[PDB]
């Protein structure tokens, strides 16, 4: 069965920077098959679909985050990557990425002094 | 009975803003990730529902809203937001539920030397309720002397024409938006994710 799970967030000065990781299991040799894709959590049950990354490679982002965040895969390591450069006090909020039809829980990132 | 989605975003023609399109979704599947797992938009934003859930949910109707307003507009249509759009054309509640997508349609909504076809609602005595809609065309009274029905001085017209150019910058260029709303009722759910 598929499952993905989020690593690589935590505590970062503003400016600072993280690397996001969306580990995918159970996916045998059809990881490739699959969009992948980078959300965030602000408070009222809102949700922001940060990166999208499709299966030839084609992402797109919001203007929000357009320049700072870049999002990549890894077919062979079925793995993939949301780049966040040039953090700021509003990108504060729960990432969580997923894989076709599958959802990770998140990973918290902070962005505070 | 698979929900008509490309009717809606594949659409050849889509309304201005101030005469914003709706279209009732029911009695159908819905498969939410093939607008959530697509390269094509640049905004995919959801309110009062998680993305995890969407396909998982029932709903009695959806409601599928089209228009076309600028990138820098896009903020706007969102709960809680004031400026032109909100404030005179397209206002979403607090306790909206639903998702906001849009992408950018310069390559099909602008045009050399303007544009004239697409407009928003430039004066208005008063703010939109949520989901309001007004497509009068009276004349605006700016001044304190009645119009009566007149075009002319401090009389105007409360149109406003966007003249998108394919030259200007990517926030002043046409977008194409669509507003999901997930509607639930003390009825049958006829909207359901594929489980
Ligand atoms: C809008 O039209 C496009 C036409 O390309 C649809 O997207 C394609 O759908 C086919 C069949 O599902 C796929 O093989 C392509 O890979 C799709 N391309 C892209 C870029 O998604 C799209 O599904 C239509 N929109 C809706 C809401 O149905």
Redesign the pocket.
Known sequence: EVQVVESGGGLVQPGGSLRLSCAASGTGSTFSTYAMGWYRQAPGNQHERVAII?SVGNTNYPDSVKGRFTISRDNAKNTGYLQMNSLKSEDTAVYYCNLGTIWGQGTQVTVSS | NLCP??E???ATRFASVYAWNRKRISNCVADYS??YN???FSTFKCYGVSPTKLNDLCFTNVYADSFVIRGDEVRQIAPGQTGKIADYNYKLPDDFTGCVIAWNSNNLDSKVGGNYNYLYRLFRKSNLKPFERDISTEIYQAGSTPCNGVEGFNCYFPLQSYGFQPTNGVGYQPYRVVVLSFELLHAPATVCGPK
Request: proline share 0%.
């Open positions: 499709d | 989605f490309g809606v975003f594949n093939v607008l697509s390269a094509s």
